Structure 1
Amino acid sequence: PRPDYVLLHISDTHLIGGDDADDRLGELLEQLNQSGLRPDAIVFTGDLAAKGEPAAYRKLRGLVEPFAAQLGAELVWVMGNHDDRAELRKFLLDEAPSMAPLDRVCMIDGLRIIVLDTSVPGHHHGEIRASQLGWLAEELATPAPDGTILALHHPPIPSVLDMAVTVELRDQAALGRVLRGTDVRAILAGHLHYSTNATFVGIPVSVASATCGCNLVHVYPDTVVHSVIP
C-alpha cells in the first residue's frame, strides 16, 4: 500500500549559540538520508532554538535546508515556547521581524498543512489568541481535497505529569469548538519530549519526542499512521 503522502515529524531540536543538540540532529538527518526516505514535507513542531538565539537559527537553517532540498521536501517550521518569533522570522525565514503569531497555511498537492503558534512570548505555557481562532475557523471553512494536518507546539492533551501542567496549552475548549467537525485529520505536536498520542475532540494527536529520534507520518486515504523512529 503506497500512502498518499509521507511526512517527517521532528520536534524540540533545542539548538544553541555554539560551544549537544547539534550532533544529535546531524546524526538524525544523516540516518534519514541513508534510509532512502523521500518525504513530501518535513514538519518541525517547535522549540527549534533553545534560547531563540539568531546564531541557533542560522545553524539550524544550514543543517536542514540542504537536507530538505536534496529530498525535494517542503520545509514546515513551527514556533515553540523556547523560540523567538522575530529572530525566527529574520534568521530562519528571511522575513521582516515581527512578534505576530507564526500562523501559516501550506498545500502539499491536496493535503493542507496548517501551522499554528501556541507560544506565548516570554512564557512557557501555551495559549491561542481569539484572532488566531477566527483565522483558523475561516481557513477550515473550505475543505482540502485530502483534509488537513494541523501542526503546533503545545499539544491539546491532558498532562500526565505534574511538571507538565504549568506549561500546558491553556483554554483547550476554545480550540476544540473550532476544530470539531472540520477536515482536520491529525494534529502534530511537540513540547513533551517523549512520544505520546491521544485524541482531541475525536482528532488524533501525535507528539514526537525530542531530538536533543523523530516520527514518520504516512497519510493514507482513510487513516494517518504515525511511526516512532528511534
Structure 2
Amino acid sequence: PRPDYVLLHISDTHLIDADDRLGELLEQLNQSGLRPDAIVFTGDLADKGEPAAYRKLRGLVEPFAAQLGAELVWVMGAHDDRAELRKFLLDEAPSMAPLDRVCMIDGLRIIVLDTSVPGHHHGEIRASQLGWLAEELATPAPDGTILALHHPPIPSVLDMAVTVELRDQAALGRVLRGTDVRAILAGHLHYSTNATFVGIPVSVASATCGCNLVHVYPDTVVHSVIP
C-alpha cells in the first residue's frame, strides 16, 4: 500500500549531549533512504530558548530537510522563546504572539498551534487562537488536517506531569469536534504515547534527548516508533 504522505515526527530536542543525539538521528534517517514530505518538530526545540541553540538547530536541520525536499515544520514548546525562535529559526521579526501557522502539503493541511505560555511550563490555548483555529477549520482540506502542538490534549498518567499539562482542553475539543482533523501530533511527555481526544487520534513522540514515522493513508494515519 502506497501512502498519500509521509511525515517525520521528532520532538523535544532540548538544544543549548543533545547536539549529537539529534545529529546521529538525522543521518540514520538520511541513510535509511526515507523521503518524507514534511519534518515536524513538536516543541522544546531549545532547552533555554537560546539564540545560540536556535542557530545551531537550524544549521543541523535545514540542510538535512533540503536534501530530502521536505518541508520543515517548527512548533513552539514550553522551553522555547517565541521571539528568539522567530528571529533565529524563522528569519522573522521578533514577536511574543503565539506561533500559529497553516501549511498545505499538496492536499494535506498541517496546522501549527502554540500551546506554550511564556515563562511557564504548563500549556494553554488562548481565546484568539481558538477563534483563529475554528475559522481555519471551517474550510475542509482535500486530504484532511494534521494538527501539530506541544502539550498533548490527553490525561496525565503521572502526577509530576499534571502541573505542566495542557489546561482547558474542553475548549479545544469543542473546536476540533466534527472538523477534518485526522491526527494530533504532540510532544512534551518524553515517552511514546497515544490516545484519542474527542475521537481524534493523538500521537506523542518521545524525546530526542528516537522519533516517529507518520504514513498518511487515504483512510487512516499510521504512527510508528523508530528507536
1:187 equivalent in alignment to 2:184:
yes
* Residue 204 (structure 1) aligns with: 201
Q: What are the within-5 Å matches in structure 2 for residues 19-34 of structure 1?
A: 20-34=17-31
Offset at residue 189 of structure 1 (A): 0.1
Offset at residue 203 of structure 1 (A): 0.1
Q: Give the secondary-structure state (helix, strand or coil) at the position aligned to 1:182.
A: coil
Q: Give the secondary-structure state (helix, strand or coil) at the position aligned to 1:166.
A: helix
Offset at residue 125 of structure 1 (A): 0.3
User: Deviations 1:120-155 (Å, cap 9, x if unpaired)?
Assistant: 000000000000000000000000000000000000
Offset at residue 105 of structure 1 (A): 0.1
Q: What are the within-5 Å matches in structure 2 for residues 213-228 of structure 1?
A: 213-228=210-225
CA distance in structure 1 between the partners assigned to 2:99 and 2:186 by the alignment: 15
CA distance in structure 2 between the partners assigned to 1:110 and 1:163 by the alignment: 40
Offset at residue 196 of structure 1 (A): 0.1
Offset at residue 50 of structure 1 (A): 0.2
Offset at residue 84 of structure 1 (A): 0.1
User: Deviations 1:178-215 (Å, cap 9, x if unpaired)?
Assistant: 00000000000000001000000000000000001000
User: Deviations 1:160-191 (Å, cap 9, x if unpaired)?
Assistant: 00110000000000000000000000000000
* Residue 44 (structure 1) aligns with: 41
Offset at residue 224 of structure 1 (A): 0.1
Offset at residue 60 of structure 1 (A): 0.1
Structure 2: tracts of 5 or more residues without a match: none
User: Deviations 1:10-64 (Å, cap 9, x if unpaired)?
Assistant: 0000000xxx000100000010000000000000000000000000000000000
CA distance in structure 1 between the partners assigned to 2:2 and 2:161 by the alignment: 37
CA distance in structure 1 between the partners assigned to 2:7 and 2:102 by the alignment: 16
CA distance in structure 2 between the partners assigned to 1:163 and 1:127 by the alignment: 17
CA distance in structure 2 between the partners assigned to 1:194 and 1:35 by the alignment: 23
Identity level (%): 99
Tell me the matched-pair count. Answer: 227
CA distance in structure 2 between the partners assigned to 1:36 and 1:119 by the alignment: 34
What is the TM-score when the length of structure 2 is the normalising length?
1.00
CA distance in structure 2 between the partners assigned to 1:83 and 1:92 by the alignment: 11
Moved over 2 A (4+): none
Q: Give the secondary-structure state (helix, strand or coil) at the position aligned to 1:94.
A: coil
* Residue 172 (structure 2) aligns with: 175
CA distance in structure 2 between the partners assigned to 1:125 and 1:209 by the alignment: 18
Offset at residue 217 of structure 1 (A): 0.1
The RMSD of aligned alpha carbons is: 0.2
Q: Give the secondary-structure state (helix, strand or coil) at the position aligned to 1:178.
A: helix
Q: Give the secondary-structure state (helix, strand or coil) at the position aligned to 2:57.
A: helix
* Residue 159 (structure 2) aligns with: 162
Offset at residue 110 of structure 1 (A): 0.1
